[PDB]
Design an enzyme around this catalytic site. Structure first.
Site, PDB file in Angstrom:
ATOM      1  N   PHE A  68       4.854   1.527   8.479  1.00 40.73           N
ATOM      2  CA  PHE A  68       4.747   2.642   7.553  1.00 40.73           C
ATOM      3  C   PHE A  68       6.059   3.400   7.575  1.00 40.73           C
ATOM      4  O   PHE A  68       6.659   3.567   8.635  1.00 40.73           O
ATOM      5  CB  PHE A  68       3.649   3.675   7.944  1.00 40.73           C
ATOM      6  CG  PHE A  68       2.243   3.171   7.896  1.00 40.73           C
ATOM      7  CD1 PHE A  68       1.513   3.200   6.706  1.00 40.73           C
ATOM      8  CD2 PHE A  68       1.616   2.731   9.047  1.00 40.73           C
ATOM      9  CE1 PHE A  68       0.182   2.754   6.661  1.00 40.73           C
ATOM     10  CE2 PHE A  68       0.288   2.286   9.009  1.00 40.73           C
ATOM     11  CZ  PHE A  68      -0.424   2.306   7.818  1.00 40.73           C
ATOM     12  N   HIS A 105      -0.103   5.490  16.854  1.00 47.60           N
ATOM     13  CA  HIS A 105       0.868   4.581  16.241  1.00 47.60           C
ATOM     14  C   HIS A 105       2.218   4.730  16.927  1.00 47.60           C
ATOM     15  O   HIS A 105       2.672   5.852  17.186  1.00 47.60           O
ATOM     16  CB  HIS A 105       1.003   4.845  14.745  1.00 47.60           C
ATOM     17  CG  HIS A 105      -0.263   4.577  14.008  1.00 47.60           C
ATOM     18  ND1 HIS A 105      -0.497   3.386  13.362  1.00 47.60           N
ATOM     19  CD2 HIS A 105      -1.404   5.299  13.897  1.00 47.60           C
ATOM     20  CE1 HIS A 105      -1.717   3.394  12.857  1.00 47.60           C
ATOM     21  NE2 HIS A 105      -2.285   4.546  13.161  1.00 47.60           N
ATOM     22  N   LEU A 141      -1.715  11.371  14.523  1.00 51.80           N
ATOM     23  CA  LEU A 141      -1.189  10.019  14.633  1.00 51.80           C
ATOM     24  C   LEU A 141      -0.394   9.829  15.906  1.00 51.80           C
ATOM     25  O   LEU A 141      -0.144   8.681  16.312  1.00 51.80           O
ATOM     26  CB  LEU A 141      -0.286   9.680  13.450  1.00 51.80           C
ATOM     27  CG  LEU A 141      -0.866   9.713  12.048  1.00 51.80           C
ATOM     28  CD1 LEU A 141       0.277   9.529  11.068  1.00 51.80           C
ATOM     29  CD2 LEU A 141      -1.932   8.655  11.844  1.00 51.80           C
ATOM     30  N   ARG A 171       0.858  -1.172   0.000  1.00 46.68           N
ATOM     31  CA  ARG A 171       0.000   0.000   0.000  1.00 46.68           C
ATOM     32  C   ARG A 171       0.893   1.219   0.000  1.00 46.68           C
ATOM     33  O   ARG A 171       1.724   1.366   0.898  1.00 46.68           O
ATOM     34  CB  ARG A 171      -0.918  -0.001   1.210  1.00 46.68           C
ATOM     35  CG  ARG A 171      -1.927   1.069   1.213  1.00 46.68           C
ATOM     36  CD  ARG A 171      -3.107   0.615   2.031  1.00 46.68           C
ATOM     37  NE  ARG A 171      -4.076   1.681   2.239  1.00 46.68           N
ATOM     38  CZ  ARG A 171      -4.259   2.314   3.391  1.00 46.68           C
ATOM     39  NH1 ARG A 171      -3.557   2.004   4.478  1.00 46.68           N
ATOM     40  NH2 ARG A 171      -5.175   3.271   3.459  1.00 46.68           N
ATOM     41  N   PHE A 207       1.950  10.739   1.385  1.00 44.69           N
ATOM     42  CA  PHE A 207       1.559  10.325   2.728  1.00 44.69           C
ATOM     43  C   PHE A 207       2.447   9.231   3.284  1.00 44.69           C
ATOM     44  O   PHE A 207       3.102   9.449   4.307  1.00 44.69           O
ATOM     45  CB  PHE A 207       0.093   9.887   2.745  1.00 44.69           C
ATOM     46  CG  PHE A 207      -0.869  11.053   2.768  1.00 44.69           C
ATOM     47  CD1 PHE A 207      -1.066  11.782   3.932  1.00 44.69           C
ATOM     48  CD2 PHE A 207      -1.548  11.445   1.625  1.00 44.69           C
ATOM     49  CE1 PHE A 207      -1.927  12.867   3.967  1.00 44.69           C
ATOM     50  CE2 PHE A 207      -2.422  12.520   1.653  1.00 44.69           C
ATOM     51  CZ  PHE A 207      -2.606  13.242   2.826  1.00 44.69           C
ATOM     52  N   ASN A 244      -1.351  -0.673  12.762  1.00 48.70           N
ATOM     53  CA  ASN A 244      -2.132  -1.407  13.739  1.00 48.70           C
ATOM     54  C   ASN A 244      -3.601  -1.352  13.376  1.00 48.70           C
ATOM     55  O   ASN A 244      -4.024  -0.631  12.455  1.00 48.70           O
ATOM     56  CB  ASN A 244      -1.878  -0.877  15.163  1.00 48.70           C
ATOM     57  CG  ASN A 244      -2.398   0.545  15.386  1.00 48.70           C
ATOM     58  OD1 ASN A 244      -3.545   0.871  15.062  1.00 48.70           O
ATOM     59  ND2 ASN A 244      -1.553   1.400  15.958  1.00 48.70           N
ATOM     60  N   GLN A 247       3.568   1.554   2.932  1.00 46.29           N
ATOM     61  CA  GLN A 247       3.238   0.553   3.960  1.00 46.29           C
ATOM     62  C   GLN A 247       3.716  -0.837   3.534  1.00 46.29           C
ATOM     63  O   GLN A 247       3.561  -1.225   2.382  1.00 46.29           O
ATOM     64  CB  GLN A 247       1.719   0.529   4.233  1.00 46.29           C
ATOM     65  CG  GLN A 247       1.281  -0.406   5.353  1.00 46.29           C
ATOM     66  CD  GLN A 247      -0.224  -0.462   5.508  1.00 46.29           C
ATOM     67  OE1 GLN A 247      -0.965   0.336   4.908  1.00 46.29           O
ATOM     68  NE2 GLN A 247      -0.697  -1.445   6.286  1.00 46.29           N
TER      69      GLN A 247
END
Ligand SMILES: *[Se]c1ccccc1C(=O)Nc1ccccc1
Length: 164
Positions: free
Chosen positions: A112, A125, A121, A54, A59, A101, A62
């Protein structure tokens, strides 16, 4: 000494180069140790051969789902999931390494590389390291992503391990 680890990344078989990561074991030793061991493969499983599944330009990238290769899998060296160690390190900007998660205390192996400074965030995370070298490789990975996250090439961690 905090571990330095590497990921060598391919796009459809073409080498993109090496991402070198510092794992902040001095702050989050358990989270750092999980990633370090998944890079060396010393527990009999880990990131070698798995994919960045991903990728959202502007951004994040992943990766780490080495069991199902689609965001549903992965596991830690401790068991399927392990707790949030702490939220001391923040999402300060490009190059941050952060655990994926599915809510509190569900860390596994997915992670990430985050390109964005966001208080939202922070506290959700676990941050556990950052890019030392290869942010140009990260931006090349980024170049093969899309709004949905689907990648236009198969982005593969062809080799990974520990430098120090
Ligand atoms: Se950046 C980052 C760091 C940790 C967890 C998630 C992200 C992230 O950017 N997620 C995301 C951004 C944009 C669209 C979908 C998902």
């Amino acid at each position: 000494g905090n571990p330095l680890v590497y990921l060598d990344v391919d796009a459809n078989g073409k080498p993109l180069g090496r991402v070198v990561l510092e794992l902040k074991a001095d702050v989050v030793p358990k989270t750092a140790e999980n990633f370090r061991a998944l890079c060396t493969g010393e527990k009999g499983f880990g990131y070698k051969g798995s994919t960045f599944h991903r990728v959202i330009p502007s951004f994040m990238c992943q990766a780490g789902d080495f069991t199902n290769h689609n965001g549903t899998g992965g596991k830690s060296i401790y068991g399927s999931r392990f707790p949030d160690e702490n939220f001391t390190l923040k999402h300060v900007g490009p190059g941050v390494l952060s655990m994926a998660n599915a809510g509190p205390n569900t860390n596994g192996s997915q992670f990430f590389i985050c390109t964005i400074k966001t208080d939202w965030l922070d506290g959700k995370h676990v941050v556990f390291g950052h890019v030392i070298e290869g942010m140009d490789v990260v931006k090349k990975i980024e170049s093969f992503g899309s709004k949905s996250g689907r990648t236009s090439k198969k982005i593969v961690i062809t080799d990974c391990g520990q430098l120090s």
